[PDB]
Design a protein around this ligand. Structure first.
Ligand SMILES: Nc1ncnc2c1ncn2[C@@H]1O[C@H](COP(=O)(O)O)[C@@H](O)[C@H]1O
Ligand code: NA
Length: 717
């Protein structure tokens, strides 16, 4: 019943879980007062000895008989790396980098890295801490213009990259004269495609006459194993105050700014105060799907290392192996972002259909049982979400599936953890207040509950944004409070509810900020667009916009669904051109034929669109668009019940229902879902056509919707 009883019962009957329980003595040695980060990390990892620390899906290599090329294919199991092995491989990397013949790194230099999350990436991250470097994890979805800007600002000496991202890593490195070495990780020896991507990087660097040196991570470790360990602690300038990490975020300004993490703040991920974001000693077996560059990726991964647990890494970056991985790893602790919860709920609606059951009926309850017991692996003891708000209906559903309480954890890159199930986390938060936002209509005198921007003093507050004292100042008031940008309602002494943002950047259900004003500037260059105001709700997974089209567009296409299609195609292409993410493409529009103007109240005296006025005039209609699609996605029930139409038409119509917007020639990617949309599409078509419809056939750039139909037809034969 209670958590402690549930834990005691799992450890009595499960040998794998029994072997993973935290050891109080290891945490006591590692977190002792005054101990430097590097040594803390060393004490956790050496302390947990031969336990399995990390697990990667196993694969096999076989010679393709048509092409001759050695290809890798996933196996239905995981292989593990021990705490001892992890520590030893990380030390090897530090030893090799400190001792390189020509470009030895020193403490305080920067290392930039682009990868997903993996055993290798984790090695490299730890090695940076051992050397006293400052790490700069870069977002795998950023454009090379953004990567170059961050690299120009931080001047890294070493750049690391997974094989998947190597080509963007070469482009950045060529524009960044400080880079002396390029390290290539997640490299599979004997796999032809990996070997070729490294050869092509070397050619590009050759052709440029670059002095940059390329090494695989394997080779670096091989070399380092033969060298003595570096001395801890490393020779940095400021002890605990030494700059260990930069987490780039766009929340406070709309473009990336480098949140400074000294070693004393990074230490909080390793068994420190971030324990309490979510909150009896539980064995920690976790599946990690979050990039290391996202503070949530680091919280999970280092939390599990620091508790002597095991992290199972999601097998593919697209997340297409999601259920397979959870069904194999069978975690005891779940952390979701709300988008994952939406996806599980969409699966549950799918299963209701397939067995033709309804509502809360007994066979509908059997679907929840198989989610909890089989698909999610049946050992979930605790669960949390965060990064974005969750509807009460989605929370109710997830909890009825898992049969455990779903903790809501609020915090940020800048502040650390701030609340747990409404209640301020003290420590580290020491004081708070609310600040009125009269332009949006929120005031501490509101009834029934005060509303305002949350402002806090907290022990885990960042010292600044790197090299950006102006941007730093904007987030601190004259009394020393950090300004979160988040509007909240207060419902009891020191209890809060997320309501809105003070400005023009917000989270969607994926947990990533979207900068409304940047998207507006990009989308405003469409020849069809006169004015555009982009709108989002943080409980949704996609955006909307209010568009005033040009007279020529309104004349050529009219003011209904066909101009919305025209606009979609135009925006989609801009998004492809400027490297925007799939979810930052508006899915549906309010077409306004009457322009925004000063007379209207929509434009200020200075000509600029006022967001609060857009909201006051179009907010209801925008919220209706969202509501109606969420109500209507049983249009799939009618797409399934046919059979009576050709393959392509079902393929089309299916893509249309899942991505809000069609045309036979489009690519599913262009159309603006996200990688979990293609998983859902894939199961849907598999159900109907009893054919395997893999995500890689659906997402690969050279495959449009006609290739998808074509694939299904060929498989059927
Ligand atoms: N549990 C939550 N509920 C609502 N919004 C959240 C929650 N957790 C994080 N956020 C939002 O995500 C931002 C932090 O983003 P990051 O800096 O990526 O951790 C916050 O300022 C909020 O806007
Ligand atoms: Na998001």
């Amino acid at each position: 019943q209670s958590l402690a009883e549930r834990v005691a019962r799992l450890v009595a009957i499960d040998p794998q879980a029994a072997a993973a329980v935290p050891d109080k003595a290891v945490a006591e040695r590692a977190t002792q007062q005054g101990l430097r980060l590097a040594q803390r990390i060393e004490a956790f990892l050496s302390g947990y000895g031969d336990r399995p620390a990390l697990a990667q899906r196993a694969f096999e290599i076989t010679k393709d008989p048509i092409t001759g090329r050695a290809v890798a294919t996933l196996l239905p199991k995981f292989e593990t790396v021990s705490y001892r092995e992890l520590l030893e491989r990380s030390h090897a990397i530090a030893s090799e980098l400190a001792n390189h013949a020509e470009a030895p790194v020193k403490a305080g230099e920067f290392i930039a890295t682009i990868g997903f999350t993996s055993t290798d990436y984790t090695s490299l991250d730890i090695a940076g801490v051992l050397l006293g470097l400052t790490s700069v994890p870069l977002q795998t979805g950023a454009t090379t213009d953004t990567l170059k800007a961050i690299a120009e600002e931080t001047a890294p000496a070493v750049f690391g990259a997974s094989v998947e991202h190597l080509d963007n890593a070469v482009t950045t490195a060529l524009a960044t004269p400080s880079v002396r070495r390029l390290l290539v990780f997640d490299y599979r020896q004997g796999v032809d495609e990996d070997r070729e991507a490294v050869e092509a990087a070397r050619s590009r660097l050759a052709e440029a006459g670059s002095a940059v040196l390329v090494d695989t991570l394997d080779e670096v470790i091989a070399r380092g194993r033969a060298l003595p360990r570096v001395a801890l602690p490393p020779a940095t300038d400021a002890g605990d105050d030494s700059l260990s990490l930069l987490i780039y975020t766009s929340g406070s300004t709309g473009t990336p700014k480098g949140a400074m993490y000294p070693e004393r703040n990074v230490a909080q991920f390793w068994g420190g105060i971030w324990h309490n974001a979510f909150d009896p000693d539980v064995p920690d077996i976790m599946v990690n799907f979050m990039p290391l560059s996202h503070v949530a990726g680091r919280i999970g991964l280092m939390g599990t290392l620091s508790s002597g647990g095991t992290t199972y890494f999601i097998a593919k970056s697209d997340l297409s192996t999601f259920f397979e991985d959870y069904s194999l790893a069978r975690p005891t602790k779940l952390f979701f972002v709300p988008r994952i919860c939406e996806m599980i709920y969409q699966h549950y609606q799918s299963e209701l259909d397939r067995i033709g059951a309804a509502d809360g009926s007994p066979q509908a309850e059997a679907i929840k049982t198989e989610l909890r017991e089989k698909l999610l692996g049946g050992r979930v003891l605790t669960a949390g979400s965060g990064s974005a708000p969750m509807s009460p209906e989605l929370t109710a559903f997830i909890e009825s599936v898992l049969q455990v309480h779903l903790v809501d954890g609020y915090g940020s890159t800048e502040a650390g953890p701030v609340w747990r199930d409404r209640k301020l986390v003290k420590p580290p938060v020491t004081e708070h207040k609310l600040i009125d936002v009269p332009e949006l209509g929120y005031f501490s005198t509101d009834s029934p509950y005060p509303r305002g921007e949350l402002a806090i003093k907290t022990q885990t507050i960042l010292p600044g944004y790197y090299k950006r004292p102006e941007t730093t100042a904007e987030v601190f008031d004259e009394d020393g409070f950090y300004l979160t940008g988040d509007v909240v309602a207060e419902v009891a002494p020191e209890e809060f509810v997320y309501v809105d943002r003070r400005k023009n950047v917000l989270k969607l259900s994926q947990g990533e900020f979207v900068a409304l004003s940047k998207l507006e500037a990009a989308y405003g260059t469409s020849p069809l667009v006169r004015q555009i105001s982009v709108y989002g709700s943080s409980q949704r997974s996609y955006l909307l916009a209010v568009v005033v089209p040009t007279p020529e567009a309104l004349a050529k296409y009219g003011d209904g669904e066909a101009v919305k299609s025209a606009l979609g195609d135009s925006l989609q292409k801009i998004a492809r051109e400027e490297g925007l993410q799939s979810y930052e493409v508006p899915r549906d529009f309010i077409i306004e034929t009457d322009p925004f103007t000063i007379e209207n109240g929509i434009l200020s005296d200075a000509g600029k669109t006022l967001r609060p006025k857009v909201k006051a005039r179009y907010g209801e209609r925008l919220e209706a668009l969202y509501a109606q699609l969420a109500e209507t996605q049983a249009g799939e029930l009618r797409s399934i019940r046919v059979g009576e139409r050709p393959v392509i038409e079902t393929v089309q119509r299916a893509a249309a229902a899942l991505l809000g917007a069609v045309d036979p020639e489009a690519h599913f990617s262009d159309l603006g879902g996200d990688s979990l949309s293609a998983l859902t599409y894939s199961n849907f078509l598999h159900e109907i056509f009893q054919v395997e419809v893999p995500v890689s056939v659906i997402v690969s750039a050279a495959n449009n919707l006609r290739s998808v139909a074509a694939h299904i037809e060929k498989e059927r034969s």
